[PDB]
Design a protein around this nucleic acid. Structure first.
Ligand SMILES: [Mg+2]
Ligand SMILES: [Mg+2]
Ligand SMILES: [Mg+2]
Ligand SMILES: [Mg+2]
Ligand SMILES: [Mg+2]
Ligand SMILES: [Mg+2]
Ligand SMILES: [Mg+2]
Ligand SMILES: [Mg+2]
Ligand SMILES: [Mg+2]
Ligand SMILES: [Mg+2]
Ligand SMILES: [Mg+2]
Ligand SMILES: [Mg+2]
Ligand SMILES: [Mg+2]
Ligand SMILES: [Mg+2]
Ligand SMILES: [Mg+2]
Ligand SMILES: [Mg+2]
Ligand SMILES: [Mg+2]
Ligand SMILES: [Mg+2]
Ligand SMILES: [Mg+2]
Ligand SMILES: [Mg+2]
Ligand SMILES: [Mg+2]
Ligand SMILES: [Mg+2]
Ligand SMILES: [Mg+2]
Ligand SMILES: [Mg+2]
Ligand SMILES: [Mg+2]
Ligand SMILES: [Mg+2]
Ligand SMILES: [Mg+2]
Ligand SMILES: [Mg+2]
Ligand SMILES: [Mg+2]
Ligand SMILES: [Mg+2]
Ligand SMILES: [Mg+2]
Ligand SMILES: [Mg+2]
Ligand SMILES: [Mg+2]
Ligand SMILES: [Mg+2]
Ligand SMILES: [Mg+2]
Ligand SMILES: [Mg+2]
Ligand SMILES: [Mg+2]
Ligand SMILES: [Mg+2]
Ligand SMILES: [Mg+2]
Ligand SMILES: [Mg+2]
Ligand SMILES: [Mg+2]
Ligand SMILES: [Mg+2]
Ligand SMILES: [Mg+2]
Ligand SMILES: [Mg+2]
Ligand SMILES: [Mg+2]
Ligand SMILES: [Mg+2]
Ligand SMILES: [Mg+2]
Ligand SMILES: [Mg+2]
Ligand SMILES: [Mg+2]
Ligand SMILES: [Mg+2]
Ligand SMILES: [Mg+2]
Ligand SMILES: [Mg+2]
Ligand SMILES: [Mg+2]
Ligand SMILES: [Mg+2]
Ligand SMILES: [Mg+2]
Ligand SMILES: [Mg+2]
Ligand SMILES: [Mg+2]
Ligand SMILES: [Mg+2]
Ligand SMILES: [Mg+2]
Ligand SMILES: [Mg+2]
Ligand SMILES: [Mg+2]
Ligand SMILES: [Mg+2]
Ligand SMILES: [Mg+2]
Ligand SMILES: [Mg+2]
Ligand SMILES: [Mg+2]
Ligand SMILES: [Mg+2]
Ligand SMILES: [Mg+2]
Ligand SMILES: [Mg+2]
Ligand SMILES: [Mg+2]
Ligand SMILES: [Mg+2]
Ligand SMILES: [Mg+2]
Ligand SMILES: [Mg+2]
Ligand SMILES: [Mg+2]
Ligand SMILES: [Mg+2]
Ligand SMILES: [Mg+2]
Ligand SMILES: [Mg+2]
Ligand SMILES: [Mg+2]
Ligand SMILES: [Mg+2]
Ligand SMILES: [Mg+2]
Ligand SMILES: [Mg+2]
Ligand SMILES: [Mg+2]
Ligand SMILES: [Mg+2]
Ligand SMILES: [Mg+2]
Ligand SMILES: [Mg+2]
Ligand SMILES: [Mg+2]
Ligand SMILES: [Mg+2]
Ligand SMILES: [Mg+2]
Ligand SMILES: [Mg+2]
Ligand SMILES: [Mg+2]
Ligand SMILES: [Mg+2]
Ligand SMILES: [Mg+2]
Ligand SMILES: [Mg+2]
Ligand SMILES: [Mg+2]
Ligand SMILES: [Mg+2]
Ligand SMILES: [Mg+2]
Ligand SMILES: [Mg+2]
Ligand SMILES: [Mg+2]
Ligand SMILES: [Mg+2]
Ligand SMILES: [Mg+2]
Ligand SMILES: [Mg+2]
Ligand SMILES: [Mg+2]
Ligand SMILES: [Mg+2]
Ligand SMILES: [Mg+2]
Ligand SMILES: [Mg+2]
Ligand SMILES: [Mg+2]
Ligand SMILES: [Mg+2]
Ligand SMILES: [Mg+2]
Ligand SMILES: [Mg+2]
Ligand SMILES: [Mg+2]
Ligand SMILES: [Mg+2]
Ligand SMILES: [Mg+2]
Ligand SMILES: [Mg+2]
Ligand SMILES: [Mg+2]
Ligand SMILES: [Mg+2]
Ligand SMILES: [Mg+2]
Ligand SMILES: [Mg+2]
Ligand SMILES: [Mg+2]
Ligand SMILES: [Mg+2]
Ligand SMILES: [Mg+2]
Ligand SMILES: [Mg+2]
Ligand SMILES: [Mg+2]
Ligand SMILES: [Mg+2]
Ligand SMILES: [Mg+2]
Ligand SMILES: [Mg+2]
Ligand SMILES: [Mg+2]
Ligand SMILES: [Mg+2]
Ligand SMILES: [Mg+2]
Ligand SMILES: [Mg+2]
Ligand SMILES: [Mg+2]
Ligand SMILES: [Mg+2]
Ligand SMILES: [Mg+2]
Ligand SMILES: [Mg+2]
Ligand SMILES: [Mg+2]
Ligand SMILES: [Mg+2]
Ligand SMILES: [Mg+2]
Ligand SMILES: [Mg+2]
Ligand SMILES: [Mg+2]
Ligand SMILES: [Mg+2]
Ligand SMILES: [Mg+2]
Ligand SMILES: [Mg+2]
Ligand SMILES: [Mg+2]
Ligand SMILES: [Mg+2]
Ligand SMILES: [Mg+2]
Ligand SMILES: [Mg+2]
Ligand SMILES: [Mg+2]
Ligand SMILES: [Mg+2]
Ligand SMILES: [Mg+2]
Ligand SMILES: [Mg+2]
Ligand SMILES: [Mg+2]
Ligand SMILES: [Mg+2]
Ligand SMILES: [Mg+2]
Ligand SMILES: [Mg+2]
Ligand SMILES: [Mg+2]
Ligand SMILES: [Mg+2]
Ligand SMILES: [Mg+2]
Ligand SMILES: [Mg+2]
Ligand SMILES: [Mg+2]
Ligand SMILES: [Mg+2]
Ligand SMILES: [Mg+2]
Ligand SMILES: [Mg+2]
Ligand SMILES: [Mg+2]
Ligand SMILES: [Mg+2]
Ligand SMILES: [Mg+2]
Ligand SMILES: [Mg+2]
Ligand SMILES: [Mg+2]
Ligand SMILES: [Mg+2]
Ligand SMILES: [Mg+2]
Ligand SMILES: [Mg+2]
Ligand SMILES: [Mg+2]
Ligand SMILES: [Mg+2]
Ligand SMILES: [Mg+2]
Ligand SMILES: [Mg+2]
Ligand SMILES: [Mg+2]
Ligand SMILES: [Mg+2]
Ligand SMILES: [Mg+2]
Ligand SMILES: [Mg+2]
Ligand SMILES: [Mg+2]
Ligand SMILES: [Mg+2]
Ligand SMILES: [Mg+2]
Ligand SMILES: [Mg+2]
Ligand SMILES: [Mg+2]
Ligand SMILES: [Mg+2]
Ligand SMILES: [Mg+2]
Ligand SMILES: [Mg+2]
Ligand SMILES: [Mg+2]
Ligand SMILES: [Mg+2]
Ligand SMILES: [Mg+2]
Ligand SMILES: [Mg+2]
Ligand SMILES: [Mg+2]
Ligand SMILES: [Mg+2]
Ligand SMILES: [Mg+2]
Ligand SMILES: [Mg+2]
Ligand SMILES: [Mg+2]
Ligand SMILES: [Mg+2]
Ligand SMILES: [Mg+2]
Ligand SMILES: [Mg+2]
Ligand SMILES: [Mg+2]
Ligand SMILES: [Mg+2]
Ligand SMILES: [Mg+2]
Ligand SMILES: [Mg+2]
Ligand SMILES: [Mg+2]
Ligand SMILES: [Mg+2]
Ligand SMILES: [Mg+2]
Ligand SMILES: [Mg+2]
Ligand SMILES: [Mg+2]
Ligand SMILES: [Mg+2]
Ligand SMILES: [Mg+2]
Ligand SMILES: [Mg+2]
Ligand SMILES: [Mg+2]
Ligand SMILES: [Mg+2]
Ligand SMILES: [Mg+2]
Ligand SMILES: [Mg+2]
Ligand SMILES: [Mg+2]
Ligand SMILES: [Mg+2]
Ligand SMILES: [Mg+2]
Ligand SMILES: [Mg+2]
Ligand SMILES: [Mg+2]
Ligand SMILES: [Mg+2]
Ligand SMILES: [Mg+2]
Ligand SMILES: [Mg+2]
Ligand SMILES: [Mg+2]
Ligand SMILES: [Mg+2]
Ligand SMILES: [Mg+2]
Ligand SMILES: [Mg+2]
Ligand SMILES: [Mg+2]
Ligand SMILES: [Mg+2]
Ligand SMILES: [Mg+2]
Ligand SMILES: [Mg+2]
Ligand SMILES: [Mg+2]
Ligand SMILES: [Mg+2]
Ligand SMILES: [Mg+2]
Ligand SMILES: [Mg+2]
Ligand SMILES: [Mg+2]
Ligand SMILES: [Mg+2]
Ligand SMILES: [Mg+2]
Ligand SMILES: [Mg+2]
Ligand SMILES: [Mg+2]
Ligand SMILES: [Mg+2]
Ligand SMILES: [Mg+2]
Ligand SMILES: [Mg+2]
Ligand SMILES: [Mg+2]
Ligand SMILES: [Mg+2]
Ligand SMILES: [Mg+2]
Ligand SMILES: [Mg+2]
Ligand SMILES: [Mg+2]
Ligand SMILES: [Mg+2]
Ligand SMILES: [Mg+2]
Ligand SMILES: [Mg+2]
Ligand SMILES: [Mg+2]
Ligand SMILES: [Mg+2]
Ligand SMILES: [Mg+2]
Ligand SMILES: [Mg+2]
Ligand SMILES: [Mg+2]
Ligand SMILES: [Mg+2]
Ligand SMILES: [Mg+2]
Ligand SMILES: [Mg+2]
Ligand SMILES: [Mg+2]
Ligand SMILES: [Mg+2]
Ligand SMILES: [Mg+2]
Ligand SMILES: [Mg+2]
Ligand SMILES: [Mg+2]
Ligand SMILES: [Mg+2]
Ligand SMILES: [Mg+2]
Ligand SMILES: [Mg+2]
Ligand SMILES: [Mg+2]
Lengths: 275, 48
RNA sequence: CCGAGGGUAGGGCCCGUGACUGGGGCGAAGUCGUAACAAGGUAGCUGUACCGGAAGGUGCGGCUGGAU
RNA sequence: UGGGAGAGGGUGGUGGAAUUCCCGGAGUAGCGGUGAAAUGCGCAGAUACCGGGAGGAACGCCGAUGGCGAAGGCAGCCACCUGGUCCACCCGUGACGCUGAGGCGCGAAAGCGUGGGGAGCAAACCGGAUUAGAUACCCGGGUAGUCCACGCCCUAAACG
RNA sequence: CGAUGUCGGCUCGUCGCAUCCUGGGGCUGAAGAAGGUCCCAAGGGUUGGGCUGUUCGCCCAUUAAAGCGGCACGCGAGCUG
RNA sequence: GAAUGCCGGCAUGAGUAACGAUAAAGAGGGUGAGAAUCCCUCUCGCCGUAAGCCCAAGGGUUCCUACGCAAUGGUCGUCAGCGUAGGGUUAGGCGGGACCUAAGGUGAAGCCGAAAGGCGUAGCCGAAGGGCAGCCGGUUAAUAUUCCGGCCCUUCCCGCAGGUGCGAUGGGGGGACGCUCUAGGCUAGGGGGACCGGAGCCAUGGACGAGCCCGGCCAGAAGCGCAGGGUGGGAGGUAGGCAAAUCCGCCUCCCAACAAGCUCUGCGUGGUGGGGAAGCCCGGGUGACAACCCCCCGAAGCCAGGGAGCCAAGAAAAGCCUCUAAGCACAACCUGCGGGAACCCGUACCGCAAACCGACACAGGUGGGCGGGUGCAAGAGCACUCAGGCGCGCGGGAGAACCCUCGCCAAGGAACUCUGCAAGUUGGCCCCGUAACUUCGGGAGAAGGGGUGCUCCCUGGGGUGAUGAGCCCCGGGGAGCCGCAGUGAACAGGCUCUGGCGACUGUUUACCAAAAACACAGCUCUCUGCGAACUCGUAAGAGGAGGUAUAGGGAGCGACGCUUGCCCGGUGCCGGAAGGUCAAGGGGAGGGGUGCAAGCCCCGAACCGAAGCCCCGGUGAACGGCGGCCGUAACUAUAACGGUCCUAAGGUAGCGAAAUUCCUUGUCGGGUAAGUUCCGACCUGCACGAAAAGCGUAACGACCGGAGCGCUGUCUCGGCGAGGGACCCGGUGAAAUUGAACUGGCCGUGAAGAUGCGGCCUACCCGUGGCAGGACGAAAAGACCCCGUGGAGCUUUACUGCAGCC
RNA sequence: GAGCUAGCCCUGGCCAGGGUGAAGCUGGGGUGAGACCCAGUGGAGGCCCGAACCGGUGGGGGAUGCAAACCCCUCGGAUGA
């Protein structure tokens, strides 16, 4: 659960922090970190293409194993669970009896010293990876691939998961975190269990300073600008939107669906999301 | 107060220098023009 | 030195009073509607919640101190 | 010491019926609703029927005037953890008791906070009726909520 | 309109007189004291505060009186703003 | 002859303003044609967390010496950063390169673009980051870690001796890391010494003294010592580290393990080499065979890759070590020793400034390190002062107005004014003490008050020693002394009550607005299933993100508390395989031109034929909206109640003359002697209202109101005083402006406000200090306002296009 | 043209001194066990006071300036967005 502070500053009154309980090792494996290159929201032209980015804490990118079908049958002992700054989930360090060392995203309930393994023959226990065809209907999985051997794409953030719902030919039916119902190829790998650190969302940043530490620069409202800047700009005094509420670039921003309707994956999405 | 000209030799040579102009179409035109006008110095002098 | 007390400052308690305001009691010679006592014309009462000019209503759970 | 009965409490699992929604089939002129109607739904194919899927909530018969708990209260089934109580033996302790201002804990429902979940139901709200009027009683909708966890609230025709 | 700085205050005055006061008068429904009203008269004088940017105005305490106007609604190459 | 014309020259303003910080000057001696200004001595003042010293930028000879003074220097000049000339910068160890990588740049392969060109993994370039071997002293007019002296060290080549499976651009280890707090031990630096060295001194009343004054160190290989940093050892198994591996990883067994050992660094010591004060004497000589020791204080530096805590989770690559692959094992490498070899560029000087950026020798701007002492609680604050550097490149008089900065002020005490604007008051430390309210942190330094110097006596604990003395630190209790006054100087909150707005710390219109604006945690809607949506680009390619719905975009709202009603007719968005309309296209009934013909050519109906629109429905924390009239109650007044027109539906809670109220200084209450402002109420709200959120709300605010206490030259109402100017004399010497001028008042006239016209009046000629009423004074071809078929930013259900999407 | 200015990326550096005293830790009380309370230890914070440093609130001066934004006094932040 999340940690509160006494109100000994105005900002400590509401600031909350992760308890970091499941963490067992405060330093990253030297062979598995590499320098993450700060973009600031800028691209190869040097132009901002994602606004209000940059200035956050320096990080190294811990390499994560998003395949696991790499090493079928080769078990590994769960050696440590660590803090990864590049993602909301925690990471777990695996010592393969191979000798090889790898990170995965740490599932809910994964215990240090436990063994896990990937494969068609793997047991149905948290931390194990299998093609979806061999996971019992109804069990909840994470780190799901979208296509075979292309990497884990779904159910990766703190506390999230997906549930197998049924089998239709070469494909399985998943309920994605978003409530969407989607077909996924059965030969896509997953990992039984939900992603851990489920309290991530109960955290209260507490002060503007904290957002800055995360690389989030301040966001400027359209209504606070001028006509040259934004559809919502101008007006004497404050002003209501006075048009359909729009983006900085003029497209409507309350309800306008933006998925390409002729996308080939539509053939595989059973039901659009809930909530 | 802090004025506009804050001399910096590496900045000078790497911005206006001969090798900068030669690298680009507009830069070569600056040199073509300056040679056609008879400039004694095609490029700023930096003590390098 | 202590010292009646006087002076500066800051607290606590009580009383009187105050533009205005909330309901309460009584009056009855009025206006609205009829909530309760009969199965009182939606059985009643009830804690709570939300709502309605008003009596009141509805929801949830409870009691019989409810006629057939 | 050796036995019994039980919806007493907690946690984890799990079964079937029904409702609603979605997909497929088949079929057509109405369905629904009432005291009688209308709103509503329906030829953009409803209802009625067959198959599939999803989801939440509540447990038909057994069930009784029954059982249990200090009260509130407790009802599918399996297990684990745990409470009280009755019995027969008359074995051990030797008045160790009864009560109980404060205290502490528990405490239906509604309501609150944080996060889930949401089928049915249903405050508020919208419409249809009924009516002299009808901010109601009846009808078609419908949001909190009803459900789960954690923390509060501490009330009651909390009654025998 | 190749610019004549526009409210109010402060400072500094000066002038007009249709006079607020003080001086001189006639009439009175002028007993006296005190007023009313008109005439002469511009020499001097004509207060301090609360409100409001205010001018003005109301109000407080006085006063012989607490006058009204002109001077680019006097005066920003004098100040304020 | 005019174009506020263009170029040039020269006037006027004028011997006028000014001569650039108010840190400050006086005299004597010298030089010289000439001296306030150059040199020298004495006295004085100023800086000293600098106004002193070192370094990086940047500047580019400004450095040193001789000789000069036309110009430059705000005066002067014999002087100079100026003119002429000569001289001056010395490195294997300092910095950069022959080393490494960062963002970034470039770019084999590859990708894309009409052209030019845009990208792009590897590689390469790229530093103030990694890495790497030099310290003290002496010397020159001017360079010195560079020359010299002393003592040290690195790399490369070759050779020798011993050793080993040697061998890499490949594998591995390491390099290798945050913020905050911090231990132990040291050093830098500092203070004291009754001790050691020293030239001398005794004044002016006293002192020949534990007297005064001065100084009492620096570098150093191996070894040793003290303190720290780093690392476990052996065996077996081995499928992983894109080959191999004995290395590393992983599993197991065995000793060892907070030890030692091994290794590395700091500090001390250390053969040796150095330095060495005041004073006197003409940069040097002496001091002097200088001494070179003890004690206390003590880093933010060092040991260091130390330790702990925390969440925001903290470069790379080489050098280095190890592993092996070809290869090669006469080689090759490792270790010791010896000899040889060691290149290129920089080095002067200024460097918080007169040499850099500001047109100037410009009160501005400029990154890093050293920055002593005493006192004040501390400190880089403040005052003084060391070393060191200065007196700011015009002066001399005078003692007006006025101005600036400053000091005091009788009585009063905000009466000033738009406002206590400004200025007073308060002011550090220690002790006592402290309210509403509150989110329980706060409010709080609340408020308010007492203490504060010096002397003597007693006294408690700590640091260093040793346990003691000495030194240093933190105290406590008595008794006294002086003055107007003890943080005796300097530095150093005035306070309170009550509203508005914003939760808060932050952000902003560089150079007129710092705010109530923006941001902000937080809340809600919404889009997006990943080759995501969305953004930049024609594209490739990027960002998003090496992220995956607890995530990312967009929008509004803006901590938190209690809340957030009604209207879906219009617009928007979403849902809707029916229907209506609907383009190219399909189709070809029918019709036409022509030909002698077969034929060629053209028109063309029904019917099929997408999105979009129309149509059905949903949707408000989507755009937005949220009524009128008549009548009714035991007095009047009012209307719970009924009636009726209209609407998509008629504003709920809460608030209300408000940052909103026109009438308006609404009315009433409060405060005041008096209150258009303020607070509290009322409600006929011109024209509040619920996420362009509604109503509150502790704390916070250089925000804007209202009041009080304290204290004041703000004021009654002004006075005096100080310095810098103003004034006078010597020196240098501008400016805007300027049709020409021989340039008075009034009353008139005049294009309507006349020195210039009329009439009258006044008036000798010319200056200096002052004041501002006029010259419709100067400045800028009015910003207001209009005009121009003038321009530009912005908006949209204006027109017409285009991108983008369908 | 980003040697000024705005944002970001990479790599370095700087922030005297003083005050407040969160969590945690240990001890003590408490209880059936706890919550919790007290003392000590501790050293948190877009914490407080105040230099450097970064600013630019109010006022005065300056206004052919020392300066085409400066000077004096006062004032804001000063471990952090
Ligand atoms: Mg946890
Ligand atoms: Mg908290
Ligand atoms: Mg805390
Ligand atoms: Mg808490
Ligand atoms: Mg707060
Ligand atoms: Mg976390
Ligand atoms: Mg925590
Ligand atoms: Mg954790
Ligand atoms: Mg690496
Ligand atoms: Mg990466
Ligand atoms: Mg990146
Ligand atoms: Mg690039
Ligand atoms: Mg580019
Ligand atoms: Mg950019
Ligand atoms: Mg963007
Ligand atoms: Mg950005
Ligand atoms: Mg949150
Ligand atoms: Mg971050
Ligand atoms: Mg945000
Ligand atoms: Mg914003
Ligand atoms: Mg704006
Ligand atoms: Mg623009
Ligand atoms: Mg535009
Ligand atoms: Mg626009
Ligand atoms: Mg707008
Ligand atoms: Mg507007
Ligand atoms: Mg606006
Ligand atoms: Mg306006
Ligand atoms: Mg407006
Ligand atoms: Mg605006
Ligand atoms: Mg606005
Ligand atoms: Mg605004
Ligand atoms: Mg508008
Ligand atoms: Mg709006
Ligand atoms: Mg609009
Ligand atoms: Mg797919
Ligand atoms: Mg610079
Ligand atoms: Mg330059
Ligand atoms: Mg340079
Ligand atoms: Mg440079
Ligand atoms: Mg540069
Ligand atoms: Mg170049
Ligand atoms: Mg030239
Ligand atoms: Mg030439
Ligand atoms: Mg050029
Ligand atoms: Mg007395
Ligand atoms: Mg009745
Ligand atoms: Mg009834
Ligand atoms: Mg009833
Ligand atoms: Mg009501
Ligand atoms: Mg009503
Ligand atoms: Mg109701
Ligand atoms: Mg009951
Ligand atoms: Mg009865
Ligand atoms: Mg039954
Ligand atoms: Mg029973
Ligand atoms: Mg017995
Ligand atoms: Mg309860
Ligand atoms: Mg309940
Ligand atoms: Mg609730
Ligand atoms: Mg529902
Ligand atoms: Mg009615
Ligand atoms: Mg509600
Ligand atoms: Mg709720
Ligand atoms: Mg409830
Ligand atoms: Mg009962
Ligand atoms: Mg004009
Ligand atoms: Mg002119
Ligand atoms: Mg003019
Ligand atoms: Mg008279
Ligand atoms: Mg009489
Ligand atoms: Mg008369
Ligand atoms: Mg007179
Ligand atoms: Mg007169
Ligand atoms: Mg007035
Ligand atoms: Mg008026
Ligand atoms: Mg009188
Ligand atoms: Mg007028
Ligand atoms: Mg007048
Ligand atoms: Mg007028
Ligand atoms: Mg005037
Ligand atoms: Mg005037
Ligand atoms: Mg003026
Ligand atoms: Mg004026
Ligand atoms: Mg003038
Ligand atoms: Mg004037
Ligand atoms: Mg004024
Ligand atoms: Mg003004
Ligand atoms: Mg002419
Ligand atoms: Mg002219
Ligand atoms: Mg001219
Ligand atoms: Mg001309
Ligand atoms: Mg000219
Ligand atoms: Mg003159
Ligand atoms: Mg001065
Ligand atoms: Mg001279
Ligand atoms: Mg001379
Ligand atoms: Mg001299
Ligand atoms: Mg001094
Ligand atoms: Mg130069
Ligand atoms: Mg020279
Ligand atoms: Mg000369
Ligand atoms: Mg000369
Ligand atoms: Mg000169
Ligand atoms: Mg000069
Ligand atoms: Mg000479
Ligand atoms: Mg010179
Ligand atoms: Mg020479
Ligand atoms: Mg050498
Ligand atoms: Mg070479
Ligand atoms: Mg380097
Ligand atoms: Mg070197
Ligand atoms: Mg050395
Ligand atoms: Mg030199
Ligand atoms: Mg030299
Ligand atoms: Mg080897
Ligand atoms: Mg190697
Ligand atoms: Mg690293
Ligand atoms: Mg580093
Ligand atoms: Mg030393
Ligand atoms: Mg000392
Ligand atoms: Mg020394
Ligand atoms: Mg030691
Ligand atoms: Mg192997
Ligand atoms: Mg000597
Ligand atoms: Mg000698
Ligand atoms: Mg001797
Ligand atoms: Mg420090
Ligand atoms: Mg460490
Ligand atoms: Mg975190
Ligand atoms: Mg790290
Ligand atoms: Mg790298
Ligand atoms: Mg071989
Ligand atoms: Mg060897
Ligand atoms: Mg070479
Ligand atoms: Mg050279
Ligand atoms: Mg040199
Ligand atoms: Mg400076
Ligand atoms: Mg400096
Ligand atoms: Mg100089
Ligand atoms: Mg300039
Ligand atoms: Mg000068
Ligand atoms: Mg200067
Ligand atoms: Mg020193
Ligand atoms: Mg002091
Ligand atoms: Mg002090
Ligand atoms: Mg200071
Ligand atoms: Mg001294
Ligand atoms: Mg001077
Ligand atoms: Mg004079
Ligand atoms: Mg006085
Ligand atoms: Mg007073
Ligand atoms: Mg007084
Ligand atoms: Mg005031
Ligand atoms: Mg109070
Ligand atoms: Mg409190
Ligand atoms: Mg606070
Ligand atoms: Mg005090
Ligand atoms: Mg207060
Ligand atoms: Mg004394
Ligand atoms: Mg001072
Ligand atoms: Mg003071
Ligand atoms: Mg203070
Ligand atoms: Mg004051
Ligand atoms: Mg107050
Ligand atoms: Mg407010
Ligand atoms: Mg604010
Ligand atoms: Mg604001
Ligand atoms: Mg608030
Ligand atoms: Mg806020
Ligand atoms: Mg704020
Ligand atoms: Mg701050
Ligand atoms: Mg501006
Ligand atoms: Mg500004
Ligand atoms: Mg400007
Ligand atoms: Mg500007
Ligand atoms: Mg200003
Ligand atoms: Mg501003
Ligand atoms: Mg401010
Ligand atoms: Mg703003
Ligand atoms: Mg804002
Ligand atoms: Mg909110
Ligand atoms: Mg790409
Ligand atoms: Mg990407
Ligand atoms: Mg990426
Ligand atoms: Mg992402
Ligand atoms: Mg905002
Ligand atoms: Mg509250
Ligand atoms: Mg309503
Ligand atoms: Mg609507
Ligand atoms: Mg609509
Ligand atoms: Mg519209
Ligand atoms: Mg649609
Ligand atoms: Mg049909
Ligand atoms: Mg035909
Ligand atoms: Mg024919
Ligand atoms: Mg809503
Ligand atoms: Mg509308
Ligand atoms: Mg709206
Ligand atoms: Mg209204
Ligand atoms: Mg009102
Ligand atoms: Mg209001
Ligand atoms: Mg209004
Ligand atoms: Mg009006
Ligand atoms: Mg009216
Ligand atoms: Mg009004
Ligand atoms: Mg008015
Ligand atoms: Mg009034
Ligand atoms: Mg009045
Ligand atoms: Mg006022
Ligand atoms: Mg006002
Ligand atoms: Mg009214
Ligand atoms: Mg808005
Ligand atoms: Mg507003
Ligand atoms: Mg503020
Ligand atoms: Mg403020
Ligand atoms: Mg005065
Ligand atoms: Mg004086
Ligand atoms: Mg004077
Ligand atoms: Mg003077
Ligand atoms: Mg004077
Ligand atoms: Mg004379
Ligand atoms: Mg003439
Ligand atoms: Mg005229
Ligand atoms: Mg005239
Ligand atoms: Mg005349
Ligand atoms: Mg004439
Ligand atoms: Mg004439
Ligand atoms: Mg004439
Ligand atoms: Mg005359
Ligand atoms: Mg004049
Ligand atoms: Mg004039
Ligand atoms: Mg004239
Ligand atoms: Mg004039
Ligand atoms: Mg004038
Ligand atoms: Mg103009
Ligand atoms: Mg013009
Ligand atoms: Mg004009
Ligand atoms: Mg004009
Ligand atoms: Mg006009
Ligand atoms: Mg036209
Ligand atoms: Mg025209
Ligand atoms: Mg036009
Ligand atoms: Mg235009
Ligand atoms: Mg789009
Ligand atoms: Mg860095
Ligand atoms: Mg600081
Ligand atoms: Mg403490
Ligand atoms: Mg701890
Ligand atoms: Mg801060
Ligand atoms: Mg702070
Ligand atoms: Mg702080
Ligand atoms: Mg502070
Ligand atoms: Mg200022
Ligand atoms: Mg002031
Ligand atoms: Mg002043
Ligand atoms: Mg001023
Ligand atoms: Mg100016
Ligand atoms: Mg100053
Ligand atoms: Mg200050
Ligand atoms: Mg300050
Ligand atoms: Mg501060
Ligand atoms: Mg500080
Ligand atoms: Mg920090
Ligand atoms: Mg930071």
């Amino acid at each position: 659960a999340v940690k509160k502070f006494k109100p000994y500053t105005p900002s400590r009154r509401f600031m909350t922090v992760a308890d970091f309980s499941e963490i067992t090792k405060t330093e990253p494996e030297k062979s598995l970190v590499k320098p993450l290159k700060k973009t600031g929201g800028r691209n190869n032209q040097g132009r901002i293409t994602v606004r209000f980015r940059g200035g956050g804490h320096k990080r190294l990118y811990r390499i994560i194993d998003f395949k696991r079908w790499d090493k079928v049958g080769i078990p590994a002992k769960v050696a440590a669970i660590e803090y990864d700054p590049n993602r909301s989930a925690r990471i777990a360090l695996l010592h393969y009896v191979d000798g090889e060392k790898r990170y995965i995203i740490a599932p809910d309930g994964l215990q240090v010293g436990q063994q896990v393994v990937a494969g068609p023959d793997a047991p149905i226990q948290v931390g194990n990876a299998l093609p979806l065809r061999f996971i019992p209907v109804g069990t909840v999985v994470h780190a799901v691939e979208l296509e075979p051997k292309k990497g884990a794409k779904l159910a990766r953030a703190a506390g999230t998961s997906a549930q197998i719902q049924g089998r239709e030919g070469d494909y399985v039916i998943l309920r994605l975190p978003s409530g969407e119902l989607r077909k996924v190829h059965g030969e896509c790998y997953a990992t039984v269990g939900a992603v851990g650190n489920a309290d991530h969302k109960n955290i209260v940043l507490g002060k503007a300073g904290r957002s800055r530490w995360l690389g989030r620069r301040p966001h400027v409202r359209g209504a606070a600008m001028n006509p040259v800047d934004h559809p919502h700009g101008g007006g004497e005094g404050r002003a209501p939107r006075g048009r359909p509420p729009a983006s900085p670039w003029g497209w409507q921003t309350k309800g306008l669906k933006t998925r390409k309707r002729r996308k080939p994956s539509s053939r595989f999405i059973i039901a659009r999301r809930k909530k | 107060m802090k004025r506009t000209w804050q001399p910096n030799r590496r900045k000078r040579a790497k911005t206006h220098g001969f090798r900068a102009r030669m690298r680009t179409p507009g830069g070569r035109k600056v040199l073509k023009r300056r040679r056609q006008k008879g400039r004694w110095r095609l490029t700023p002098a930096v003590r390098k």
